[PDB]
Amino acid sequence: SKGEELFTGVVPILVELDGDVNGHKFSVRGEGEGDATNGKLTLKFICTTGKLPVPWPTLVTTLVQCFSRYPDHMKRHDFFKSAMPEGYVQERTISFKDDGTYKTRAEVKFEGDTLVNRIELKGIDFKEDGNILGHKLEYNFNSXNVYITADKQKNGIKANFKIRHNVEDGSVQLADHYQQNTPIGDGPVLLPDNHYLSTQSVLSKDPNEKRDHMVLLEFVTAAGITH
């Protein structure tokens, strides 16, 4: 409820990613706003280093589950907000079928009134003319359920889930996600019963923007608990 108090209105968001994929360095900066009451967020991302060396859709999951709308009966299961304002570390491995792997580490926390997601990403073993480095993925993103379970040993949560990116030739590229979150502070956190997060994502372009970029709208809502 203390953490959850921080999210009662519209919250500015800042995202910073420093990326290295097959030795190719890049940076992304994102800004916008989040409304956890309605499970909604709006963000625009820029590759500040020039051309992004991987496809924007492959970065969506990496680029703030604290903005999920948790219904009233499920408030006691919201680990993400309970960890605020000190925040949580979020780590993944993302394994692209027949291609490379991303490893990510992020800290998601308040800095003043701004929720900040600061990420480091390392990608290795990518095929230089595969779907990823060859930019063969459609500019879109499907709806997914991300199943959350408690990890009481790490006093946090975990999740594994499959993302399926559409490829331009009509096939699909699997990206297998394993995720772990752990609180940054020592204060008490909420450890949840099993549930999931239903996310929809809409990608677009700003017709006035000349930099390499992604405009993102998402709606996220928690569900699957009864009593």
Residue numbers in the entry: 2 to 64, 68 to 231
Provide passages from the article that reported this PDB entry.
Two molecules comprise the unit cell with overall structures of the two being very similar (RMSD of 0.33 Å). Photoreaction of azF148 induces conformational changes in the protein; shifts in backbone and side chain placement coupled with structured water networks are likely to drive excitation switching on photolysis. As with modification with 1, a small (∼0.6 Å) but significant shift in the backbone position of residues N-terminal to residue 148, to a position similar to that occupied in sfGFP was observed on conversion to the light state. This generates a water channel and network present in original sfGFP directly to the chromophore, with the two ordered water molecules WCRO and WB also observed in the light form of sfGFP148azF. The backbone shift is critical in allowing WB access to the β-barrel in light state sfGFP148azF; the two waters, along with the phenolic oxygen, make up a potential local H-bond network.
We have used superfolder GFP (sfGFP) as a model system to exemplify and understand mechanism of action of these two different nnPTM routes. SfGFP26 is an intrinsically fluorescent protein derived from the original Aequorea victoria GFP. H148 plays an important role in defining the fluorescence properties of GFP through the contribution of the imidazole side chain to the charge transfer network that modulates chromophore protonation state equilibrium, and maintaining local structural integrity. We have demonstrated the versatility of genetically encoded phenyl azide chemistry to positively switch protein function through two different non-native PTM events: photolysis and bioorthogonal modification.
